[PDB]
Amino acid sequence: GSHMCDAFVGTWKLVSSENFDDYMKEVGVGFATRKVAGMAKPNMIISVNGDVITIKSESTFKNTEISFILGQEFDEVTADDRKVKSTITLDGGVLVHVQKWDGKSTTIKRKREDDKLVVECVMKGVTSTRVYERA
């Protein structure tokens, strides 16, 4: 049967980005990775099997994959090579992904808005908005 996380499932392509270089700077990403990652045009592939959600990010820069259960912490190696402890929950229909490392924290929110999947990335004060559409 259906679940509310159904509206996220599918294959999504990046269609716009704003402020991503400044977000990456705030996170601590170095120059060369920021340039190559900022050029990426990832696809995001989201699937669900039982309680396990899988999110893949695929681009010329990096191919990543995370699988998780809502509310249950996991260790993640990010595309920019941070080793983080992540927890993802659903808060009023928004997937909220918190990454903790070296005493720092960033939050990535994913929500459905019209036919878009909007990704908002926040690192102290700095937000980047990345908009995806169905592939």
Ligand SMILES: COc1ccc(Cc2n[nH]c(=S)[nH]c2=S)cc1
């Ligand atoms: C903090 O620097 C980062 C750099 C790149 C990535 C990979 C990625 N994943 N997801 C989206 S929306 N876009 C991209 S390019 C992740 C973090």
